[PDB]
Amino acid sequence: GSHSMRYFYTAMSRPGRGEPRFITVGYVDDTLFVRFDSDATSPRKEPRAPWIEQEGPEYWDRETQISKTNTQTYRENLRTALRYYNQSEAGSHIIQRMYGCDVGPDGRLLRGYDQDAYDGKDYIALNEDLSSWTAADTAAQITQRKWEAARVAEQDRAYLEGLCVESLRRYLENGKETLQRADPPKTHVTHHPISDHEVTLRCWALGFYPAEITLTWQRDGEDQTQDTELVETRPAGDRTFQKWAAVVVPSGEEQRYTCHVQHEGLPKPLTLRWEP
């Protein structure tokens, strides 16, 4: 149905160890498709998904140039940030950027993004209107003033409404075999006795794509949020993801618990129980 394309930049300064490292990764939904690392032997944009490989040489030269130029821009950004925050040139700092677009089933722009962070904290973000900015502090306000004077939002908007959705549409078609295929989770409940009267019930979800999923345990039909151990969704390494939820229950009461699974690959939410 709905899809997204996102580019992520990480610029990390390292005084005494060369110029700031610049890394870019591009994703369509939860699929990595392109990368760039300024520390690579011969730095250039490289394909990470089968469907992007058909893009011609002009595509790769252009995309590589964008990364090389932006490497310089973010290195400049790091020097500027030092000034804005009255910091010394002796420490290591990080600037991150995330930008891109979301489209609906019909492929029309749902919303665009372009935001930055400095040392892990919000710095500045393009608002949903794609015409104004939200600055996190007085330092970012200086950047906001510069971007308003340069009409950056309008230029970003042109990209987000044009090339962003246009290229995303192409990628979705070229990679429809995978980007447009949801793999439902393979589920099961394990039983692990802890002590004489306490047992661990763990609900597993494996091999699913995309990553979005909801796993919950209910006791007599009531959500057990506070007593559920929920691990972060993790990559399997084969494009799919894994996740589990566990609850410690009194021996003999296993049947009062039900695991509920929601995933777009499932026609309807699943309900599972321990099966002795």
Binding site: Y7, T24, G26, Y59, R62, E63, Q65, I66, S67, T69, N70, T73, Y74, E76, N77, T80, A81, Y84, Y99, I142, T143, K146, W147, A150, V152, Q155, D156, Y159, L163, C164, S167
Partner: peptide, 9 residues
């Protein structure tokens, strides 16, 4: 495809 224009802080 990326946006080729980037503006400094």
């Amino acid at each position: 495809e990326e946006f080729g224009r980037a503006f400094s802080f």
